[PDB]
Amino acid sequence: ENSHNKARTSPYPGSKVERSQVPNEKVGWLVEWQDYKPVEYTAVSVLAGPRWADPQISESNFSPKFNEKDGHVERKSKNGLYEIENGRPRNPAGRTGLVGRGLLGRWGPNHAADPIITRWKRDSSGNKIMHPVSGKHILQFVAIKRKDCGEWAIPGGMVDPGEKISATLKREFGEEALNSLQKTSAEKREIEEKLHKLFSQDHLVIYKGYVDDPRNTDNAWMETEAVNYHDETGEIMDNLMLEAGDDAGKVKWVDINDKLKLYASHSQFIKLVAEKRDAHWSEDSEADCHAL
Ligand SMILES: OC[C@H]1O[C@@H](O)[C@H](O)[C@@H](O)[C@@H]1O
């Protein structure tokens, strides 16, 4: 039922490295493939050993505790246990044609968080807006357009070592969508005040676990936790100006519907939020295909 596909594209991000070909029937690790010969690649930046990266497996003093909280490094996958073979993790979604870590710092799961902040779209009078096709109100969420992607996306990022997911969600939203890193500390508190209120009133976990990402390898992969914080009355997000963080091209409130084109698997997350919030989704019924 559909193997990961982005995790098998070439060349590997930021390189000219080509992955070994993996036929769809041979994606699952359960499938025997004695001749499987993935290319080995770990980015120079990762091999250099920065603070956010693990050492190579051979590193004498390195004894990772996979599938567990390993000190300041969360090695548990949100999709359950992952196998350890040849002393290293095996991607839970299957073969990718490349071993090593590529651009990912950690062996195993590399955690990210995606805060989906939503509010109902409102008119000049502060009332919700009903869509005629669905009869449901239009919901909006805060999206950013990165300069490196030029694609609209949920404002998320990597969990920092020793940081809790709830903290990552709040930090990323503030830094990326409210440009909090460029605030006078005084405003950083009016923000943490509004976000404190927001991040405690109406939240739902939308998705947790593996994400098909082109940075994934046989031994390291991305995982995210997408969580929706919703402002039902609009009173929390009404007087909060959006301002793109240094690494977000633009930021804006985006109307949600099934025509929305988003980065990665963010459109699927948004569809789930619309479902849970009873928001408008179907833009075109395709009824004219029978309308006569
Ligand atoms: O692709 C999975 C995740 O990767 C992270 O680097 C991004 O910041 C997230 O928005 C994305 O959901």
Let me know whether 250 and 203 are in one domain: yes
Q: What count of residues does the chain have?
A: 292
Mutation test residue for ligand 1: of 211, 267, 273, the one with most atoms within 8 Å of CB: 211
* Nearest atom of ligand 1 to the alpha carbon of 223: 2
68: left (phi over 0), alpha (psi -120 to 50) or beta: beta
Let me know whether 126 and 54 are in one domain: no
* Nearest atom of ligand 1 to the alpha carbon of 215: 1
In the reported structure, the alpha carbon of residue 286 is separated from the centroid of ligand 1 by a whole-number distance in angstroms of 33
Half-sphere exposure of 87 (CA within 13 A, CB side): 8
- Pick the closest to residue 283 from 249, 260, 264, 266 (CA basis): 260
CA distance linking residue 240 with residue 192, whole number of Å? 11
Let me know whether 128 and 86 are in one domain: no
- The phi, psi pair for 254, rounded to 5°, reads -110, 130
Amino acid (one-letter) located at 196: H
Let me know whether 137 and 272 are in one domain: yes
CA distance linking residue 63 with residue 60, whole number of Å? 8
Q: Label the pairing between strands 108-120 and 220-231.
A: parallel
What six digits make up the tokens of 101? 């870590």
Residue bearing tokens 């091999």: 47
Domain boundary residue among 159, 192, 221?
A: 221
Mutation test residue for ligand 1: of 144, 222, 263, 272, the one with most atoms within 8 Å of CB: 222
In the reported structure, the alpha carbon of residue 41 is separated from the centroid of ligand 1 by a whole-number distance in angstroms of 21
159: left (phi over 0), alpha (psi -120 to 50) or beta: beta
Query: Determination method here?
Result: X-ray
CA distance linking residue 200 with residue 148, whole number of Å? 32
Domain boundary residue among 168, 188, 221?
A: 221
Q: How far is the first Cα of the chain from the last one, in angstroms, to the nearest whole number?
A: 36
On the question of a cis peptide bond just before residue 55, with omega within 30 degrees of 0, the verdict is: no
Let me know whether 162 and 262 are in one domain: yes
CA distance linking residue 227 with residue 208, whole number of Å? 9
Let me know whether 119 and 148 are in one domain: yes
Binding pocket residue ranges, ligand 1, CB within 6 Å: 112, 114, 153-154, 156-158, 211, 213, 222, 224, 264
| Residue nearest (by alpha carbon) to ligand 1 atom 5 | 157
Let me know whether 53 and 182 are in one domain: no
| Residue nearest (by alpha carbon) to ligand 1 atom 8 | 157
What six digits make up the tokens of 94? 């299957």
DSSP the chain: ----SGGG-SS-TTS-PPPPP--GGG-STTS--TT--PEEEE-HHHHT--TTSPPPTT-TT----TTSEETTEE---TTS---EETTEE--TT---SEEEEET-SSSEEEEEEEEEEEEE-B-TTS-B-B-TTT-SBPEEEEEEE-TTT-SEE---EEPPTT--HHHHHHHHHHHHHS-GGGS-SSHHHHHHHHHHHHTTTSEEEEEEEE---TT--SSEEEEEEEEEEEESSSTTTTT------TT-SEEEEEE--TT---STTHHHHHHHHHHHHT----S---GGGT--
